[PDB]
Amino acid sequence: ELKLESVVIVSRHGVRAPTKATQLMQDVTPDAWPTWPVKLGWLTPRGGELIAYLGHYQRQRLVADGLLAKKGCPQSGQVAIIADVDERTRKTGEAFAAGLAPDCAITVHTQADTSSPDPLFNPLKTGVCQLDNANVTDAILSRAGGSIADFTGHRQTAFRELERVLNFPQSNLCLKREKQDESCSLTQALPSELKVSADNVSLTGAVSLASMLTEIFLLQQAQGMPEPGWGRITDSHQWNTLLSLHNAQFYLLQRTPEVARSRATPLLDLIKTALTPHPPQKQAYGVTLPTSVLFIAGHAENLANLGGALELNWTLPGQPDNTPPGGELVFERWRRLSDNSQWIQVSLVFQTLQQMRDKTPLSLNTPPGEVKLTLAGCEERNAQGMCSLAGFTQIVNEARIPACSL
Template sequence: MKAKICGSLCLLSAAVLLSNAHAETPSDVLQAIPHTEELLNVVVVSRHGVRSPTQSAEKLHGWSDKKWSAWPVAPGLLTSRGFYLVKATWKLNRSRAPFTYGVCPKPEDVQIIADVDERTRKTAEALNEGLYPTCGYKVKVTSSEHSAIFSPLKAKVCRIDYPKELEEKLTQKVVGINEKFAAQMAEISKLTGHEFTGPMRAKVSKYKVGFKGAPYDCSSITEIFALEWGQNPEKKVAWDQLDWNGILHLMPIRVAVFSALNRDMEVARYKGSALANKIIESLDHGPKYTYLIGHDTNLANLGEIFDLNWKLPGRDQNENTPGGYLTFEKWSVNGQPEIRVFYSALSPEQIHAERVTQPTDDFEILPRGTKFDEWKTTYGRRLQSNCIADDKYENRK
């Protein structure tokens, strides 16, 4: 069942709505009012599955003289283990709302769109094989070098107007981060045998924004440990030194650094407006099911634009798990359109198990009763119109 976990805002809002309804409406009238619900549209935005580190061998050697774990694929590619985890997740979803479909939906009722990277394309294929194994749907991928939907800056749909000012603002945001996460940085220095010191600062150009410095390096190393956890079932990671509790102790520096960049509203509007617009359009008049396969940056950008926050058991606040996904559901409730949003991901135990036997943990972000039209109007105002464009696609199996 969906919505095992509900945020405090969700619970509070629902309680207020229910108490007000019962205060104003006699119980006999309530019982006489028919309640109807119909699922209209679903949009899933998923991060790709477990991949190999994107860093070069030289970069990894600069972080530690120890021999890093061997990966079966080139840097940044989806592993066969990553493919399996995604496929198994979506195979289990066949019997879970809102994805239950009985027979295959009509081809015009399903679109699966992936970013151009191999790891996103392969993840889309794994989702398709898991959820729709006999339906014959194809994954759409832009024929351009970069996707206008997933990466409008790389695709040069728009550009950062004042790079120097944004660079200074982002650098100021992370002043004191070394002190705040001194324990995590000391632990990573101990694990790697390399001392990480020095400040972090932003680096921004017209089409690119990022961080550099010791906290950023520690953030990236923590992400590698989390990827190793998914890649190597039932084994410790970080040179056989960490279990999940050890990774979870380090995760706050990863989330903090990642969020300081990708959950900055100015950055999110540049990088996320096109994808946010695609979600709104798909919910408004798209096919019944839309699947958009991108990156953790995409989910973080959407989190900032749409005010979405999540917390799953055994994971850090707003942690982006390989294969984790946001689900936007549009329902007709008593004839009125409503929006429901969830974040879902495999538990730390399931992503590390030899075989996936349990479905994702699910966090219900928005309270029931959120009006779709009001939601669309509120957040549509945040989008940066000059960064919104669509892609041309070629079909892939």
């Protein structure tokens, strides 16, 4: 009924070491954090291998869909790869290429200067545009339930789960509060406030600490470390409860449209240029678009920003992190044969946490998880839930912030 014409994959980088080692991380547990085999924030070898499995799976699926050849290397830019300048994203691009097309030496493009941020992955970071402080503050606080106190008050079960995994009551932070007649709870020992600036939004205290620590436990599990969370995380309900704190911070700071639309605008422009039929032309990064397959190696925020800007909602069965390492927002252009009309499908492809833990080789018979998505604002949908090309174009033009374009 339908023929696949084009695919754009926006991928988070693979498993990485923690990006920071702070004094507060030491003070909230009596135990020693496991050390990692690469520098802070770098991709691990295992993370690269997990990405290559997704590349291998995507080759098999795209061959089955008739888009790539079963044997040989894709020719003349049929496949293009763009990565953010960070080590972890560059090496994710290389790992994906190695799985998709081994020995084909597909180039991993970055911006010219790899020592400075690339605004494609967040235009606020180079000051292309700025957030509206009052609008962002009100929008985030409303999505939090009206205040950060309301937000943390409704999540005490998850904070107590994190405290148990940390053995928080025996930590230096708690032992000093016991000596000062103040009771030991993460949220009250580390009050959380929303900080909004022209170029960033963040949360302080327990909310951001919890978001980072629960991601570290997940990374430990995916890395195959023997005892993530000191062996105190023993079932799936516990994993889901812990990562709810991480996903909740992303819901506030990255999915909120008042942030997401600006942060996602350059990626929206690149996705639309890649998916829209037009005479091929070398554009950004020296990549010729449109082409058959474009893989973009970025960050968790990019997945969440695109989700918030485009009203794409999901949770990932079997994967506690809704923006997991190697997770892929996959945009596809399909041609309907009955009338040769053009349609856009979006899905979230991801390894389950168990597939990461077991280093499961992926294939058509053992596929990654996949969640089919719908653009909530699309008014022209086909029977398969895809948006018409014109409908998707209108949604993108409405969502994007022109001042944030490159």
